[PDB]
């Protein structure tokens, strides 16, 4: 199936409290593999997945050096943005950056991303043609011109279409056992009477990987989108995910409802009915 | 791996 690799960077200023907090994490699909925490003792890029631990010191020394360069860039960015929007040097602010690439089921380049946000709001992003930019406001346009003059977009497409896809593949290979696995969800339902005339029917999807999944409830085969309590897909903590969906059913009508499950790990969609 | 260059805003 499809795959992706992306780096997430969060920078938070700490006025009068010293250096800005900086955190970086890398993911291949839904598995995190590296991290860097400006407040940590090592001051180095660190492994968060078993399959990346085999990389030698050359890899860790290199990534530690580049991630520190990122840290410094965002430390300069915080001050610049503070200036662009004429803000008090006393308040705390946040800058986030995300970039990466997607490859199809054929492991071939599908698309590249490079987005930036200031205080949780879109600031600037690289368009899909990897040649132009989307500037949120006037401050962003100033950054856009700067990046255009420095031919930043060009350097980004080379990384996104080359290096990014190349290393993603390498990671997928080195981590075949983890990254290339598909754990079809384990499913089951629970029934709990809220009153003498209504009951809760909950549909569970457990231990599945990857995270992408579709879980719905239907009544007489019709969608119940608005009468369904659907929770956000969540991490189990062991690399797998979970999710459930529930509907309040009039006692005696359990048979009219069906749970539907779709996942890459299931050759054919599942349909469950309490009976 | 991370990208090489990182220009400021």
């Amino acid at each position: 199936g499809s795959h992706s690799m992306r780096y997430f960077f969060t920078s938070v200023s700490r006025p009068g409290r010293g250096e800005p907090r900086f955190i970086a994490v890398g993911y291949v699909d839904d598995t995190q593999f590296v991290r860097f925490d400006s407040d940590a003792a090592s001051q180095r890029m660190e492994p968060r997945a078993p399959w990346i631990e085999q990389e030698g010191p050359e890899y860790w020394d290199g990534e530690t050096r580049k991630v520190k360069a990122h840290s410094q860039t965002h430390r300069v960015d915080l001050g610049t943005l503070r200036g662009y929007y004429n803000q008090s040097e006393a308040g705390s602010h946040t800058v986030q950056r995300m970039y990466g690439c997607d490859v199809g089921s054929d492991w071939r380049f599908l698309r590249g991303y490079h987005q930036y946000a200031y205080d949780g709001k879109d600031y600037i992003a690289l368009k899909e043609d990897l040649r132009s930019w989307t500037a949120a406001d006037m401050a962003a346009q100033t950054t856009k011109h700067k990046w255009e003059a420095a031919h930043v977009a060009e350097q980004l497409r080379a990384y996104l279409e080359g290096t990014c896809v190349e290393w993603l593949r390498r990671y997928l290979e080195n981590g075949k056992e983890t990254l290339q696995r598909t754990d079809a969800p384990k499913t089951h339902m629970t029934h709990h009477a809220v009153s003498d005339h209504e009951a809760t029917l909950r549909c569970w999807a457990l231990s599945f990987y990857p995270a992408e999944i579709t879980l719905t409830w239907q009544r007489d085969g019709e969608d119940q989108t608005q009468d369904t309590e659907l929770v956000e897909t969540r991490p189990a903590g062991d690399g797998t995910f979970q999710k459930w969906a529930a509907v309040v059913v009039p006692s005696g009508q359990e048979q009219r409802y069906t749970c539907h499950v779709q996942h890459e790990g299931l050759p054919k969609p599942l349909t469950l009915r309490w009976e | 791996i991370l990208s090489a260059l990182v220009g400021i805003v």
Partner: protein, 100 residues
Amino acid sequence: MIQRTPKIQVYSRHPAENGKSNFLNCYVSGFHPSDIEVDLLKNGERIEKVEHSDLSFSKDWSFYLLYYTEFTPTEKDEYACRVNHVTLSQPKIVKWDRDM
């Protein structure tokens, strides 16, 4: 500035079976800014040995973190997750229900 309140889910890694070792999770997501306080509680008491995932965020820039701790559920022990964030006037507490 933007402020998004955290969604909270308190659950166990594996189905709950009394007497068997497991992991108690508290997943907080969709919040912003990142400064957040999250604690796991056992019968009202703050659990000391609690770890959390590295700060990351979704497509819409909102953050998400997984706080977790090893535990062995029993019939009488009650667990809950307490969270505080700038968007909450009072710390929010969500009880653990082995059915959710």
